[PDB]
Design a protein around this ligand. Structure first.
Ligand SMILES: Cc1ccc(NC(=O)c2ccc(CN3CCN(C)CC3)cc2)cc1Nc1nccc(-c2cccnc2)n1
Ligand SMILES: Cc1nc(Nc2ncc(C(=O)Nc3c(C)cccc3Cl)s2)cc(N2CCN(CCO)CC2)n1
Length: 250
């Protein structure tokens, strides 16, 4: 296996983002003195190795790049490139809005839609697509974190068909993407603020959708609304979503 590393190839450093991603650490891959991120497991082994195998198949500019794995005996490692600025939700909430302005919001939306178009075409689904599971690099680079991928839950990001019948599709990710776009357009506000988690489905069932955020262009809000179509087959494809963002650039 070309991905297999000895644990001693890595020097473990500090826990990343004060433990928000659980057991994810900064490390150094000694071969290149390259700062990396390392997810560890010392219960959920079957799950951890299945994700390791899935990440070997994925290669896109906007998905976090696997570098190696330690999957022989515990502790188990997944090693990726280090995204320097951390998760997109905290980044939006804390950013300088003079820098992170309309064109950067569009750029962030376009990048994530590019990653999801790739997964759509490669018959993968994400099971936790949200701003907190996107990572930021230099010059407003955004990559989707890829530990929760499957080959084909977070209630406020979950399509109605997934809450009701536990059924997930690429169309469920299109719903989640619309919530993520809402997170981008509000610089990382909590969706459905103050609404009890048990009543989200019944509100959605009676055609409730979140209102246009302050300053959100109408074309961007129309695309959110298309992502939140009740019928999954009425939601646009990630290919259509990416193309719509490309077209908006004036
Ligand atoms: C995709 C997106 C989603 C949301 C937003 N929202 C905002 O841009 C915005 C504007 C005003 C506020 C409100 N704000 C409150 C505080 N006071 C001080 C300022 C105003 C909030 C968000 C922009 C975008 N970006 C976007 N959308 C469509 C087109 C473009 C675009 C930009 C440049 C060139 N071509 C296209 N850029
Ligand atoms: C939570 C967090 N992660 C960061 N970067 C990461 N790179 C990649 C990550 C990741 O999880 N990889 C991964 C692995 C390893 C396995 C499977 C799947 C995947 Cl995707 S986590 C940076 C960061 N920072 C804290 C805050 N700082 C600013 C202070 O103001 C910036 C730095 N915090």
């Amino acid at each position: 296996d070309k991905w297999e590393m000895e644990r001693t190839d890595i020097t473990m450093k500090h826990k990343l983002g004060g433990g928000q991603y659980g057991e994810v650490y900064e490390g150094v891959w000694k071969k290149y003195s390259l700062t990396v991120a390392v997810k560890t497991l010392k219960m959920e082994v079957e799950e951890f190795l299945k994700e390791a195998a899935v990440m070997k198949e994925i290669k896109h500019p906007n998905l976090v790049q696997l570098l190696g794995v330690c999957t022989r005996e515990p502790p188990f490692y997944i090693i990726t490139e280090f995204m320097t600025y951390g998760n997109l939700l905290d980044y939006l909430r804390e950013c300088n809005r003079q820098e992170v302005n309309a064109v950067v919001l569009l750029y962030m939306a376009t990048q994530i839609s590019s990653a999801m178009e790739y997964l759509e075409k490669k018959n993968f689904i994400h099971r936790d697509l949200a701003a907190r599971n996107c990572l930021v690099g230099e010059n407003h680079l955004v990559k989707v974190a890829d530990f929760g991928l499957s080959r084909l839950f977070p209630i406020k990001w979950t399509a109605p068909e997934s809450l009701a019948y536990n059924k997930f599709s690429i169309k469920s990710d299109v719903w989640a993407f619309g919530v993520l776009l809402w997170e981008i357009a509000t610089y990382g506000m909590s969706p459905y603020p103050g609404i009890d988690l048990s009543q989200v489905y019944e509100l959605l069932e009676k055609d409730y959708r979140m209102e246009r955020p302050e300053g959100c262009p109408e074309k961007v809000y129309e695309l959110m609304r298309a992502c939140w179509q009740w019928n999954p087959s009425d939601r646009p494809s990630f290919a259509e979503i990416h193309q719509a963002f490309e077209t908006m650039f004036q």
